[PDB]
Structure formats: structure tokens, C-alpha cells
Design a protein around this ligand. Sequence first.
Ligand SMILES: C[C@@H]1Cc2nc(NCc3ccc(Br)cc3)[nH]c(=O)c2CN1Cc1cccc(C#N)c1
Ligand SMILES: C[C@@H]1Cc2nc(NCc3ccc(Br)cc3)[nH]c(=O)c2CN1Cc1cccc(C#N)c1
Ligand SMILES: C[C@@H]1Cc2nc(NCc3ccc(Br)cc3)[nH]c(=O)c2CN1Cc1cccc(C#N)c1
Ligand SMILES: C[C@@H]1Cc2nc(NCc3ccc(Br)cc3)[nH]c(=O)c2CN1Cc1cccc(C#N)c1
Ligand SMILES: C[C@@H]1Cc2nc(NCc3ccc(Br)cc3)[nH]c(=O)c2CN1Cc1cccc(C#N)c1
Ligand SMILES: C[C@@H]1Cc2nc(NCc3ccc(Br)cc3)[nH]c(=O)c2CN1Cc1cccc(C#N)c1
Ligand SMILES: C[C@@H]1Cc2nc(NCc3ccc(Br)cc3)[nH]c(=O)c2CN1Cc1cccc(C#N)c1
Ligand SMILES: C[C@@H]1Cc2nc(NCc3ccc(Br)cc3)[nH]c(=O)c2CN1Cc1cccc(C#N)c1
Ligand SMILES: C[C@@H]1Cc2nc(NCc3ccc(Br)cc3)[nH]c(=O)c2CN1Cc1cccc(C#N)c1
Ligand SMILES: C[C@@H]1Cc2nc(NCc3ccc(Br)cc3)[nH]c(=O)c2CN1Cc1cccc(C#N)c1
Lengths: 174, 174, 174, 174, 174, 174, 174, 174, 174, 174
Amino acid sequence: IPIVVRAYDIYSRLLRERIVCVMGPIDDSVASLVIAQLLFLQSESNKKPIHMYINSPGGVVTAGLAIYDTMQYILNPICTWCVGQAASMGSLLLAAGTPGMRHSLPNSRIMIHQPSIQAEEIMKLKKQLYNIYAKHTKQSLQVIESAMERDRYMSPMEAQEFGILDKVLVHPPQ
Amino acid sequence: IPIVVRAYDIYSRLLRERIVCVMGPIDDSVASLVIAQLLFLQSESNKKPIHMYINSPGGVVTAGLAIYDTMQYILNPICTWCVGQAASMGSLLLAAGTPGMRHSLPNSRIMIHQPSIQAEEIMKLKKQLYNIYAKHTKQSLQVIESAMERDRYMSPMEAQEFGILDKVLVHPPQ
Amino acid sequence: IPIVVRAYDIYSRLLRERIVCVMGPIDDSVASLVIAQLLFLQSESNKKPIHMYINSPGGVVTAGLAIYDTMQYILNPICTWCVGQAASMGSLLLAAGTPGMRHSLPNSRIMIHQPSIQAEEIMKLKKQLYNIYAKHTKQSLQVIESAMERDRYMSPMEAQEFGILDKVLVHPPQ
Amino acid sequence: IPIVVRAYDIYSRLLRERIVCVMGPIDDSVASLVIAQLLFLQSESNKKPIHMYINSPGGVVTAGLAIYDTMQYILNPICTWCVGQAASMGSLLLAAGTPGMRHSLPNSRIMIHQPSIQAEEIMKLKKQLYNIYAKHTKQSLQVIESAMERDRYMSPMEAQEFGILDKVLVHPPQ
Amino acid sequence: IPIVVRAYDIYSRLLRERIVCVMGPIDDSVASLVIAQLLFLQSESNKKPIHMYINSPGGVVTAGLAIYDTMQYILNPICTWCVGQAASMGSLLLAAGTPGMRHSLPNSRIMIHQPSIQAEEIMKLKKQLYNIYAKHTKQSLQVIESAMERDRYMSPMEAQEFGILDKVLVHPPQ
Amino acid sequence: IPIVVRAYDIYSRLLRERIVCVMGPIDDSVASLVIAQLLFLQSESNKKPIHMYINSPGGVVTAGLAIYDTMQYILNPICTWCVGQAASMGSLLLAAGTPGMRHSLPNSRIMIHQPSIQAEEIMKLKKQLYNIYAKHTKQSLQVIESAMERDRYMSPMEAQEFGILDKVLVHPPQ
Amino acid sequence: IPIVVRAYDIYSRLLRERIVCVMGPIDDSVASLVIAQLLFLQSESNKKPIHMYINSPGGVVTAGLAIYDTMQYILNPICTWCVGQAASMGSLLLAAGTPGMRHSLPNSRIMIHQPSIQAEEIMKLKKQLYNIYAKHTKQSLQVIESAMERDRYMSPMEAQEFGILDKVLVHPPQ
Amino acid sequence: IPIVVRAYDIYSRLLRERIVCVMGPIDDSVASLVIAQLLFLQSESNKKPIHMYINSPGGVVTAGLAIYDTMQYILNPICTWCVGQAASMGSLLLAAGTPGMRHSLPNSRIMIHQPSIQAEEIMKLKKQLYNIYAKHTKQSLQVIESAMERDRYMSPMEAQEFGILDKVLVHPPQ
Amino acid sequence: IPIVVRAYDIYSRLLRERIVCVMGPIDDSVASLVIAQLLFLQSESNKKPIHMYINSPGGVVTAGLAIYDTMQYILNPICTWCVGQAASMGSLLLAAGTPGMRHSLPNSRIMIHQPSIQAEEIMKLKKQLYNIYAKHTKQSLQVIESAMERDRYMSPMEAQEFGILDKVLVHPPQ
Amino acid sequence: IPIVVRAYDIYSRLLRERIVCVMGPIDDSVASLVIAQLLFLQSESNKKPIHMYINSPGGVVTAGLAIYDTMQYILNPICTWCVGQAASMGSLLLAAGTPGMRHSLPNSRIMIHQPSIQAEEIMKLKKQLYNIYAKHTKQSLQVIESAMERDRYMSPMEAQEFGILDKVLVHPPQ
Ligand SMILES: C[C@@H]1Cc2nc(NCc3ccc(Br)cc3)[nH]c(=O)c2CN1Cc1cccc(C#N)c1
Ligand SMILES: C[C@@H]1Cc2nc(NCc3ccc(Br)cc3)[nH]c(=O)c2CN1Cc1cccc(C#N)c1
Ligand SMILES: C[C@@H]1Cc2nc(NCc3ccc(Br)cc3)[nH]c(=O)c2CN1Cc1cccc(C#N)c1
Ligand SMILES: C[C@@H]1Cc2nc(NCc3ccc(Br)cc3)[nH]c(=O)c2CN1Cc1cccc(C#N)c1
Ligand SMILES: C[C@@H]1Cc2nc(NCc3ccc(Br)cc3)[nH]c(=O)c2CN1Cc1cccc(C#N)c1
Ligand SMILES: C[C@@H]1Cc2nc(NCc3ccc(Br)cc3)[nH]c(=O)c2CN1Cc1cccc(C#N)c1
Ligand SMILES: C[C@@H]1Cc2nc(NCc3ccc(Br)cc3)[nH]c(=O)c2CN1Cc1cccc(C#N)c1
Ligand SMILES: C[C@@H]1Cc2nc(NCc3ccc(Br)cc3)[nH]c(=O)c2CN1Cc1cccc(C#N)c1
Ligand SMILES: C[C@@H]1Cc2nc(NCc3ccc(Br)cc3)[nH]c(=O)c2CN1Cc1cccc(C#N)c1
Ligand SMILES: C[C@@H]1Cc2nc(NCc3ccc(Br)cc3)[nH]c(=O)c2CN1Cc1cccc(C#N)c1
């Protein structure tokens, strides 16, 4: 994490590009940082888009739900880019983007299995996650449950036709 | 924790927005930090409100009681925002907010079970918590005990009708 | 631990409000820090009061005795504020405050039990604690020993009746 | 890691010479840093080349594939310099360089074995790697699968004739 | 590691004397740092010499080969000074210096045993080291193999007559 | 564990008195041993009763369910004696006793909270536990769910009137 | 594990009842023991059946395949009994039983997900498992794959109608 | 633990003298062993007494209560002998002995402080302990609670005066 | 590991069936035990065959070579049965069996990759392994080197075609 | 620990010579063992002497007091032999022997410092030790306190003239 050039860090100038990247497992600290960055970008401008690079092997369910609630709260359109992999919570945040701005890369893998203590609490968490999926991906609850029951990854085109993604860019279209 | 924009980081500008975030488990250090931040915001202006983002999986009983005493001591109205999950100790602070300023998010989870060496000390602490709940939630001691005896998470609407929350917002007032 | 406001840390401005915070267990380093802060505050002003916030689950006997000797040595009046829990050494430093200026929040906890290798040394230290309590709380050595034999936490009102506290404030009296 | 010469660190000036370096094992953080550096160099100039030094013993397949997708996304030609060794996951990044600009030092070691929990996921990743190698190395899928099935290190000349490298420099052009 | 004086660290000023010290075991990070320092000194001036202090108890074979390739690539004459000892890779880098500039100290010990799990890879690396020694030391492959097969250290005079060193200085000749 | 007197061990003569014991946490090995003992006692006599002492603080749900299925399969009447305590799983084993043979000592403790990765699996297991309780205790599903939702122990008389126990002996009734 | 009755152990008499118990995770040692027990029971009598109790959360794939090959090699009919739970690797052993002798208790759990570095080898093992399941359960490979692609536990009736089980007993035949 | 002389172990013959020793902390296994020994001695003879040597630094409240219930259940009179020391549970089992047979050695130490997650559970357990003490020592609940609220050790003579002991023997009756 | 019946352990009767199972990784102790068992079976009868069950994930090269030299030294024909898998040294011992007696089960996995500090020593050992394979498998050195260079598992039929096996039995000979 | 010869262990025959060796630190287990052995030797014959070899670097105060109470309780004359050393509790048990039978060896060292949580408890225990010393050694309390306050060892002759020992033997006097 070297300093890039007014003496900005690689992750400091990154946020100055309206970009909030969620790298690694999603924990309480990472969730709080992402929420703070999203709110700061909203304060800077409530109409400009905010990019979110999603590369996480999982995380906490409550953390992802808080990040999703913050994303939906702010009035900025969220462009979710799956740069790497999209685990259960990562894939949820990916699908939680604005309709028509959920992009990805050719070798990006998406997974919605949600492998997951309090039985009733986690089951109701799964129920509300199914609800969020049915809302964003424009799908039904039965198909979402059947898909999340299978422990398997999906390709960019599969995720695009299923509703998780919208576009699959290989190079900047010009 | 990158630097945002006079060379301030996330957690510094967060406190400059009259906002305090009790993130992670509540311990002696976190409790002291929250108390200092609340008192500093009071010093800045005793009239302006203070926002408290509550996302904690639990914490210490004495720490939460100290945070509650500091909140009640300062003359600033406390807007408790349940951003994520609100454990027993965090749920107390969420209920200890100003009447009419205890907000939450759609996918937030609130718990008041308080899954809790000195048996008599922790019992008196539980009684103090019952009293605080009956005071802020405008409920009785019997119902509070019955609710805190069950290990479960309440929904935003359930916590709003029970007395823990006041409003359940999805987007800012349009 | 963010930066507050000329780019002062939270704990730095804290010491600039004549406040010393004895947080967490009391050890040699914490004791040296508290002693240095007290002496520096005396240097800044020998007549202005010094506020000592006490929240500790215990500590070292010699460390608490050093802090007490430093408090008694400096001419400044020491306002001991119990914010959280006051353990053996915490409660001892609390009772060691200037008469008429020992305060505690409504839900704070006080305990002088002192749950007491050199057996004779620690016993003589215990006798010194007995004497200090008899001096400050205006109580007799017999009742002090009888109370310290019981392992329990005193409430702010109970500690005020016992002579450990002078006031139990709920809100700034105006 | 000393400071070099306006108070620039060695790795800071390194990124300031359009020179990215995938050193050590490839993980989520390292891949995120590499992607950020690549995108920042594209922002500085989308036509000037970008140098990528590869001395990695491997890493996460997802991370390397994300780095590859980022390299292919940006319009800058990527000069992949194999320094020391180019393990499986690095070898792809070494083979993914712009044609006519993939260099390697005389004593560098190249390997594409890619030693190979979700079986279907990792095997689909292996198939994607086969496709990428066939694309960049201009080789067929059968020969790539045969070469990656053998656990061995190729020499710079061997990797050059195999299509992984374009030049094997001993000294700069005289 | 104090600061020497325009507020330069001891190692920062060391690197400003055209000097790169390979201290301790040679790992990937140390190898990358040495390569970056050598290339930076080249950029500063490709004509002035570069001093390399070699004191390491071993290291990685690929790391030493990368350092050697970097040394041979840059057009700067390398003055290798053995300060304290020279392990297998250290002694190799020592012999890899410019003819007539491979100095050492009286009590400096040189070892070329190379106590070398991919067996074929390490054996091919061993053959590469044999070739490098035969090139620089101006010796044959058989004698180099016989020497590296024995696990023992060599004195500065023995290393000078064998071809590893050129001069054995005690004090600056004036 | 001394030998008692034909040179039998404590736990050996114990099983020779048709007396099985579930001590400590219930696990795969313990459950297998209990099943083997129950089947051996059935082989010895399918009509004579079998005593099951329960002093377990819990264990695996599948193990307790295996023990329960073995108890139901064997035709022997099972006298479940709650000695010390009967945690959730043990409590099921305590409730799974033959009607009119579930005994408990005065100071014994009963608890059916069942505090408990696959969400749906554990939820269906909890549903099966609800069904088993409704069957044995002659209670409804709603009351069982309400009771098991509260994390608290029950007294012998409370468990007897609730349906978990039948008799509360202090001494052998004669 | 006390001694039962000529001073036989629990697991000793268990094997003397032509009964083998695959308890806990399946490893090399456990698989070798199961194979030895099966072959010894065959030696005793090739016509008499052999009972295999299956309570395992999984284990090594090669170990389970060795157990399956031993079961199929011996001429004795294998009566599989799912007690407690039959995880993926055990489920095969449960499904590999003789047609018409695969029993399961009411609360037992069956799972065939087979959650599974030698990527190619584990995929070929998964294909062999597909073949074995298609053979024993009298189902097509497509349905077997679509079923075990989901991570879930089947009930006794579900596994019986799917082909993994034959009978679901609650009590011995009256 | 040597063999004493029909090849008896020291503990084997010890238990053959109608003597049970609760040595060390009281856990589930120790509790089960003590219960088994007591019931075996009852089986041997219900009239003859049973000697219980108590040397424990503490233990589990549930284990001590189980041992107490077993002692009260069996008709044999229990002669409690405090050897070395008697902690909370040790002293409870000591006082639980038959009246007129609770002995202790001259230098033995008795402590009933009971220094003690479920708050309500442990509190009800402490209430049960208060009741047991009031029953056996013939003391009132108020004085019992005020006594064990202090953390101190009673001498054999003091414990005899307090009602915990009946005799303090220095030598057998001459 | 129960006892089978004149009070013989399972592994004891196993060796009494002229069988020597090399289970788990091959180490010095396991190699010594296997050699001792082979020589004991030779002493019992030099004409009767000796069965060697091979289920190993790997082992030491020297250990496997010692086992091979022992197998070749004794005049008994060695029937090597691959049960579950045959790793680097396991597969070598398997191929080292007497011609016409190397058997394997349908689902067994054979691998001769031999993924193998002394470099020259291990390379000479691997050359010896090449020679042994060429001797027993009737194959040439080049093909053996090509096969062992690939990290993959051969099926029983493939290993039979490659000369490692002579038969692939599904059931005993009818 | 070999077997000596009717197939008796070294320690078993040692205990059969009326000898109890308190070897190593004195803990609850060793204390119970010594008490049991002493009582067994009493049961065998209350007139014959009992030898006690004392070689321990310390132990527990309560354990030593229990051993002392057992020694004084039994009517057998205790011959305490100091073999190698005598720590605080070891030296106490040594002095606790019968007058005229407290022997030792030439190079045996005696220490009575007693370097010693519960301050008041250990203080009263050390007072009891003072009393025991004054009783057995025929000395006063002041001298005993002054001696135990010094952290130093004593020679056999010093301990004999002080009262701890009675004789200092080198060879059996004949
Ligand atoms: C109203 C309350 C206060 C507030 N304050 C500002 N100030 C701008 C700002 C925030 C943060 C940084 Br860093 C820098 C500048 N902007 C807002 O959007 C909010 C909203 N809050 C409600 C709310 C809603 C949903 C999720 C969360 C959460 N977590 C909180
Ligand atoms: C009177 C005593 C001193 C004092 N000092 C100031 N100065 C402002 C200030 C405080 C902190 C930072 Br950082 C920056 C500026 N402001 C106050 O509100 C208090 C109140 N204190 C009593 C008190 C009451 C309740 C909880 C606690 C606690 N813990 C302490
Ligand atoms: C006389 C000796 C020197 C001295 N020096 C100053 N200078 C002011 C100062 C101190 C510290 C910081 Br940071 C900044 C400014 N002020 C004093 O009060 C003392 C007293 N000392 C005696 C003494 C008494 C009791 C406890 C301790 C202790 N520990 C030491
Ligand atoms: C459109 C989206 C936003 C964006 N923003 C800028 N700004 C320049 C800049 C970036 C970073 C630093 Br540090 C400094 C300056 N430049 C871009 O190339 C992209 C592309 N993004 C899409 C995209 C494509 C492929 C991989 C990833 C990833 N990870 C993301
Ligand atoms: C051509 C490529 C880019 C390049 N860039 C510059 N710029 C100067 C500079 C470098 C680094 C720092 Br810090 C500061 C200033 N100078 C060069 O010598 C090289 C050579 N590279 C090829 C190359 C050859 C041998 C080993 C490695 C390696 N590892 C890489
Ligand atoms: C029919 C099958 C074979 C069998 N064999 C005997 N033999 C007596 C015996 C068993 C064990 C010892 Br040790 C000593 C003597 N007795 C039986 O009850 C059963 C029942 N089995 C079915 C079954 C039912 C429920 C749970 C499990 C389980 N786990 C297994
Ligand atoms: C022919 C070969 C030798 C042999 N020997 C006997 N003896 C009886 C016996 C075995 C074991 C104990 Br313990 C006690 C008595 N009985 C047999 O079934 C076999 C079969 N063998 C082939 C074979 C097939 C499948 C899996 C494995 C494996 N692993 C091995
Ligand atoms: C009636 C039930 C069965 C029974 N069986 C016998 N047999 C004698 C015996 C027991 C053990 C060994 Br070892 C050797 C011979 N004797 C009895 O006292 C009891 C009493 N039971 C009830 C009961 C009461 C209190 C605590 C517990 C407990 N834990 C259990
Ligand atoms: C001659 C030497 C002594 C000897 N002794 C006997 N006695 C039979 C016997 C051996 C072992 C047990 Br257990 C029980 C009975 N039988 C022999 O085969 C050998 C051969 N030895 C040479 C030799 C050759 C190859 C590998 C090794 C090895 N390791 C050793
Ligand atoms: C009266 C009570 C029962 C009793 N029983 C016998 N039986 C002989 C015997 C004991 C043990 C083995 Br092993 C073998 C044979 N002999 C006795 O001395 C005692 C004395 N007891 C009281 C007592 C006094 C002092 C310390 C402790 C202690 N700890 C206990």
C-alpha cells in the first residue's frame, strides 16, 4: 500500500473516485468502514454514481445486511463490479445494485449458496435474504431458494440471465 | 481506514458529524472512547443532537451501563440508529435514546435476551436493566423480564411496537 | 481513537480538561501515566481541581497505593468520578477523593472487597488500605474490615451512606 | 524499505515508474493492490505501457484471475517481466502479457503446473485457465492440459518456445 | 535504527551511498528490495559503482538467482564486500561481482556448500549455480562441484585463490 | 475409577445392574456406547427395565436423537433418573422415559432450551424435538416452543407438572 | 467402555454379533478396521448377514470407497442401519447395502451432498460416487447429481422413496 | 498409586473400607464416581456407615448438589471427615453429613463462601444451598447468607460452633 | 480395535492370515514393523504367499525402498492388494508384487507421481525407483519418467494396462 | 519403574516395607496417596514404625497440613528421613516426626522459609505452621518466625541443633 501522487494512499485516492471496495471477508469493522465511505460519498454528492468492487469469500450475514440497507438508504446509484469472486454476501451486494449497473468481468465467479449459532435467527436471515433477492433480481422466492440450496458457483452470463448481473464487460465499450 | 476530506480519516470525520459508532463488542476501552466522544459533542454544542450508530454483538454490562449513564447525563438528544444488529447491551442503548429518535433499518436485528464471578452482582445489574427498559420503553417489569428471558431477535416493527424503537425508515424523508 | 479538535487526540484533549482517566486494570505503566498526568496538572495549576474518572476491574495494590500517594501529595483537590465500576483499587481511589467532591453515576458499581508471593507484605498493604479507608470515609477500622470481608458491590447510594461517595448525580444540577 | 529520492519510498517510486510488482504469494489484498495500481496507471496514461514484475510462488486462483481480468480490461500494454520465478498463478499473468513484450531473465523459472473445498469450482477455474493459455500462448487446449498436468519448471528459453515468453534478455539492448 | 543527519534513516542514507546491504536471510521481500535498490542506483548513474555488503546465513535459491540476474543486467560495476560471512547464496552473489572488485574482510567466512519437494527443480538450480560459478570464478565445473559438495567455510585468502574473491583488505590502502 | 468386587470396574458393575448412565456432554462416542449398552441390556432381557442416569450438560443433537431412537426401538421400559442436572438433550432423554418412570432428585436441574453449519437441518431437528416433547410430555407444540424458547432451568416439581417428570423422590419410598 | 459378558468389551461383543459400527469420521485407520471386521465376519460365515451401523459426519473419500469395495467384494449381505445420521461418505455406505436391508430410524438424518488439493482426483471420485449411487439406488446419474448438488439432509421417508433406504422401522417387527 | 495387599489398588481397598474420597475439584466424572461408590456401599450394606473424606478446593455446584442428593437418598449414615481443607462444595458436603458424625482434623480449613452463563440458575442453586445449610447446620437462612457472603476460611473449632462440624478429633478415641 | 477369538487382536489375527497391511503414511516405525512381519511370515513358511494390503497416502522414500528390498529378499510370493488407494510409495510396493498377483479393487486409486535437504540423494533414489518400475512393470525408463512426471491418479484398469496391476477383481473368483 | 520380585513394583514393595516416600511437589493427589498409605500401614500394625522419605521442592500448605494431621492421628512412630532435600512443607513434615527418629543424610538440605490467593488464609496457615514448629522442635514462636523469615537452606547439623532433626547418620551404625 504505497503512497501515490497530495500524498494519497492507494486506498485513500481510491475513495476519492467514488469507489468503495469490499475486499476480503465482511466483518463488523469492514462493514462499518464501507457504510461510512458510502455515507461520505453521499454527502459529497447525492446524485453521482458510486462504484463498489466486490471481492469477498463470504462474511457475516448481519454485516452484509447492514451494507445493503446503507446502499438502499443513500440516493446514489450503485454500480456493483464483481472483480474476482462474489460469495453469498458478496453476491447479494452485487445483486443489490441499481438495475442496469450490475457489471462483472469474464472470469468472475458468483455464488449465492449462503453456507450457514442461532437456528431460528439464521433461518429468518435466510428468509429476508430470499426476499431481497426476489426484489432485486426480479425473480420468485421458490427459484431463489432452489438456486441458493445448490452449493455451486455461477458464470457472468449465468448470473446475468438469472438476474444477479446486468452486463458482462470485457473492455471499456468505445 | 483511509484519509477522507483537513487530512481527516473516517472515524475522525464521523465524530465531526456528531456521530458516534459503538462498533464491535463493548469493552472498557470502547466504553471510555464512547463516553469521551459523547462528552466532547456535548461540549461542542449541548443543543444539537448526537447520532449513535449501534452495531454490537454484545459487550460488558458495566460498560453499557456507563455508556447509558453518560447518554442520560448529557443534555443532548440522542438519536439511536440501529445500523445492523443490536445485541442485549446494544439494544439497551438503542432503547435508551430520546423518545421519538430511536430509528432502525429494514434488515436490522434487535435482541434483549442478555445471555448472562458474582451472581448477585449480575442479578442486580439485570434488575437495573429491567428498570431502564421499563422507563424508556414505557412498559412494565413483568413484560420486560418475560421478553429478556427469551433468546430471540426482534424485527424493526416488533421492536418499534414493543417500545425499543420509534421509527423504521427505509429511505430518508422524501 | 480518532483525532478531535489543534489536531489533538481524544485522550490528549481529555488530559487538557484536567481529566485523568484510570481505565482498565491498574498496572505499573498505567500507574506511572496517572502519576505523570496528576503532577503535570499540578504544574499547570496547583489550585484548580483535577477530575479522576475511575473504571477499573481491579489492578495492583502497589500501583493503586502509588496513585493514592500522588493524589494526596499534590495540593489540587481531586474530584473522583465513578463512571462504570469501581473495583478494589478503583473504589479505594474513589474514596480517596477530596471530601465533598466524590461523585458517582446512577448505575455505577462500587466494590472495596479487595480479594486479597509474600503473605505478610500483602497483609500489611491490606492494613494500610484499612487505615486509608478509616481516614477518608470517616469510618472505624472495625466496620471497614467487616465490609471488606464481604465480596459484594455497593450501589452509589449505599457507597454514599458508607462514606465512599459524597454525591450521586443523575444530571448536571441547574 | 528505506526512503528514496520528494521523500518517496522505494515501492512508491516503483509505482511511479509504471512498474507494478506481484511479489510473494497472491492473495486478496495483494490482488486488490495490483488492480488499484493498474487502474491508477491507466488513469495517469491509458496508452503508455505498464511493467509487471512477477516473482510469485503462486496464490489464490480467484485473485490471479481477477488480476488477469484487470490487465485485459485496461488499454495499456502490459510488459510482464519474469524475475526470479513465475509459478503457476503468476505464469498466467506472465503469459497474459502483451504479445512481443513478455520478458524473462536468464535464471528465472517458469511453471504452469497449477497444482490441482469445491471440486467443480476449481475445475471450472482450471478450464478457464486452459482457455486463457490457449488464447495468449497461441497453443491448443490439449497441449496446455498436458503441460499443466506435469509438475516441472520451464526455463526461459523453453517458456519462450512454448509461447509463454517473447524475449529472454541477459542485458539491456546495446 | 536511529535517524542520521535531512532526517534520513541509517538505511536510507546507506542506500544514498550507492550501497545495498543484503543483511540476513534472502527472502522474496528482501530480494525484491535489493533488486529495486540496484535498479534505482542504476537509474541515478549507470557509470558509478555499486557496493554490495553481503552478510547472510543463507536464503532462497530463486531469490539469489533473481538478485544475480539484476546485478548482471545493470551496467554498473558491482563491488561485493563480504562483511562477517557469506553463505551459499551470499557467497554466490559475492563471486558474481565485477572481476577485480570482489573484496572481503579478514574474519569473513565464505561458504559455497549450498545445502539444497521438487528434487529436479532444485538440482537444475544447482546446475545453474555451477555454471554461474564456472563463469565468474574462472574455474571448471568439476572443481566447483567438488567444492560445493563439501560442507565447510573458507577463509578470505582461500576464497581469493579459489576465484571467489580478488582482494583481502584490512585497512583502506593509502 | 477403582475396581470393585469378579474384579469388575465401577462402570462395569454399573452396567451389570441394568443401569446405563449418560454423564458429561453427549457425543458420537458416548451415544454409540449408550446405544450398545441399551441393546445389550435388551438382549439380556427385553422385559426387565433399564435405568438411565442423566447428568449431561448437553451435546450433539444427532447423538441425542440416536439415543432417543434406540430407547424407543427397544421394548424395555426406560426409567430416566435426572441426577444433578438434565440439559436440553438429556432433558429429551429425560422426557423420553416411560410414562410413570421419569424420576428426579430434589436439587436436580432440568432445561429444554436447546441452544443451537446448516440452518435448515438444525431447524428441522428442532421441529423433531418439538414433536417428541409434544408426544412424551402430553403437551402441545405451541407450549413446547414457548418453553424451549426461554433459556432457563426448571425445578423438579415444575418439570413434573409440565410433563417432563413423573415423580420427585427424596428417599427410597418405604 | 466397560467390560460386558468371557469378559468381552462393548465393541468386542459388537463384532461378535456380526455387527460393525462405522462411528465418527471415516479415516484410514477406521476404514482399515471396518475392512478387517467385514472380512473376519465373512471368514466366520459367508452366508450369514453383517450389520453395518452408520453414524458418521463424513471422512476421507478414498477410505469410504475402500469400505464400499470391501462390502461389495464379500458375499455376505450387508444390512445397513442409519443410526443418528448418515453423512455423505456414510450415505454411500448406507446406500451400498443389500437391496431390501437398508434401514433407518425415525429421527436419523441422511445426506449425500458430498462436500469436497487434487481437484481432478476428487472430481473423478465424485463421478465414481455418481455411478455407485445410480447402481444401488436404481436412479439415473442426472437426478443423483441434481440431488447431491444441494446441501441438505433427507428424512428417512425421503431417502427411502429416493432409493437410499428400503425400510423405516420405529420398533422391531411385532 | 502402587498395589496393596488379592492384588488390590490403594483406591480399590480404600473403597472396600466403606470410604469414599472426594479429592480435588468436583467435576461431572468425579461426581459420577462418588455417586456410584456411595450406591455400591449402600448395596453392600444399608445399615453400616460410609466415610466421606473431603479435600476439595471447589468444584461444580451441580456436581456437589448431585453428590448431596445421593447422600440424602441412601439410608446409610454418612460420616464426613474434613482432611486438609473443605471448599464451598467440599464444606457443603461436609455439613451434609449425618448429625453427630461430622468430623474434621485439627488443621483442616473450612470455607462456605461459595464464590459464584445463567444468572438465575446459579442464584436458585445458591438459594438451594442456603436451604440445605439451614437444614443441616440448624442455622437460620439470614445468618447463613451473611456468613457465606464473606470470603474467609473457618477453623475446625469455628466450623463446629457454626454447626458445620460435630467433632474435631486430634487422635482416635483412647 | 476390539479383540477377536485365543484372545487375538484384529491386527494380530490379520498377521496370522499371512497378511501385512501397510496402512497410513509409511515411516521408520511402520517400515520396521512391515519388515518384521514379512520376515516372520517367511520364517513360518517360505513357500506360502504373503498378502500386502496397500492403503497409503505417501510415506518416506527410504522406508518404501527398505520395504521393497525386504519383499525382494524373501522368497515368498507377494500378493499386493491395492485397497482404497496406492500413493507414491504405496504404488511402488504394489507394482513390486509377484507377477500375476498384483490385485486392486474397482474404486482404488493408483498414483506414481512421487512428489520428491539433500537433492542429489533424493534424485538418485528416484532414479532407483525408475529402475524398479522398469524392472517390475516391464516398461522403459522414458515412459516411467513421463508417467511419474504427471500428478494424477490411475484407475485400476489403467494401472493394469500400464503394468502396475495384473488383475482387477470385483468379487472373489467364482 | 521396573517390576521387582510376587511380581511387585518398586513402589509397591517400598510401601510393603512400611515406607511412604513423599517424592516431588506435594499436591492433592500425592497428599491423598500419602494419607492412604499411612492409614494402611497403621491398619497393618499400629505398633511398628513407619518410615517417611522426604524429598520435595515444596508443595501445597493444605496438603502438608493434611499429611501432618494424618501422621499425628495414627499411633505409629514416624521416622522421617530427609533424602536429598527438605523444602518448606517437606522440612515441616520432617520436624513433625517422632522425637528421636528424625534422621537425615550428610548432603541433605533443609529449608523452612515457606515463601508464601487468600492473604489472610495463608497467613493463618503459616501461623499454624509456626505453632507446629514450636511444638515439635521444642522452640519458641519468635525464633521460629525469625528462622522462617530467612530464605536460606540449613545443613543436617544445623537442623539437628535447631530441633528439626535428631540424628545425622552417614552409615548404618553397627
Ligand atoms: C441521519 C443519520 C446521521 C447522518 N449524518 C450524515 N452526515 C453526513 C456524513 C455521514 C457519515 C460520514 Br463518514 C461523513 C458525512 N449523513 C447521513 O446519511 C446520516 C444518516 N444517519 C442515519 C443513517 C441511515 C442509514 C445508515 C446509517 C449508518 N451507519 C445512518
Ligand atoms: C464534571 C466532570 C468533568 C467534565 N469536564 C468536561 N469538560 C468538557 C470535555 C469532557 C470530555 C472531553 Br474528551 C472533552 C471536553 N465536560 C463534562 O461533561 C464533565 C463532567 N464530568 C463529570 C462526568 C459526568 C458524567 C460522565 C462522566 C464520565 N466519564 C463525567
Ligand atoms: C520533587 C519531585 C520532582 C517534581 N518535579 C516537578 N516538576 C513538574 C512536573 C512533573 C511531572 C511532569 Br510529566 C511535568 C511537570 N513536579 C513535582 O510535583 C515534583 C515532585 N517530585 C517529587 C514527587 C512527589 C510525589 C510523587 C512523585 C512521583 N512519581 C514525585
Ligand atoms: C468503471 C469502474 C470505475 C473506474 N474508475 C476509474 N477511475 C480512475 C481510477 C481507478 C482507480 C484508482 Br486507485 C485511481 C483512479 N478508473 C477505472 O478504470 C474504473 C473502472 N471501473 C470498472 C472496473 C473494470 C475492471 C476492474 C475493476 C476493478 N477493480 C473496475
Ligand atoms: C525495462 C524494465 C522497466 C525498468 N524501468 C526502469 N526505470 C528506472 C527505475 C526502476 C526501478 C526503481 Br525502484 C526506480 C527507477 N529501470 C529499469 O532498469 C527497468 C527494467 N525493467 C526491466 C527489468 C530488468 C531486470 C530486472 C528487473 C526486475 N525486477 C526488470
Ligand atoms: C437388527 C439390528 C441388529 C441387532 N442385533 C442385536 N443383537 C443383540 C446385541 C446388540 C448389541 C450388543 Br453390544 C449386544 C447384543 N440386537 C439388536 O437390538 C439389533 C438391532 N439392530 C438394529 C438396530 C435398531 C436400533 C438401533 C440400532 C443401533 N445402533 C440397531
Ligand atoms: C484374497 C485376499 C486375502 C484374504 N484373506 C482372507 N483370510 C480371511 C481373513 C481376513 C481378514 C481377517 Br482380520 C481375518 C480372516 N480373507 C479374505 O476375504 C481375503 C481377500 N483378500 C483380498 C481382499 C479383497 C478385498 C479387500 C481386501 C482388503 N483390505 C482384500
Ligand atoms: C432405583 C434407581 C436404580 C438403582 N439401582 C440400584 N442397584 C444397586 C447398585 C447401584 C449402583 C452400583 Br455401581 C452398584 C449397585 N441401587 C440404587 O440405589 C438405585 C436407585 N436408583 C435411583 C437413584 C437414586 C439416587 C441417585 C441415583 C444416581 N445416580 C439413582
Ligand atoms: C540374516 C539376517 C537375520 C535373519 N534372521 C531371521 N530369523 C527369522 C525371523 C526374523 C525376524 C522375525 Br520378527 C522373526 C523371525 N530371518 C531372516 O530372514 C534374517 C535375515 N537377516 C538378514 C536380513 C535381510 C533382509 C532384510 C533384513 C531386515 N530388516 C534382514
Ligand atoms: C475413622 C475414619 C475411617 C477409618 N477407617 C480405617 N480403616 C483402615 C484403612 C484406611 C485406609 C486404607 Br487405604 C486402608 C485401611 N482406618 C482409619 O484410620 C480410619 C479413620 N478415619 C478417620 C480419619 C482420620 C484421620 C485422617 C483421615 C483421612 N483422610 C481419616
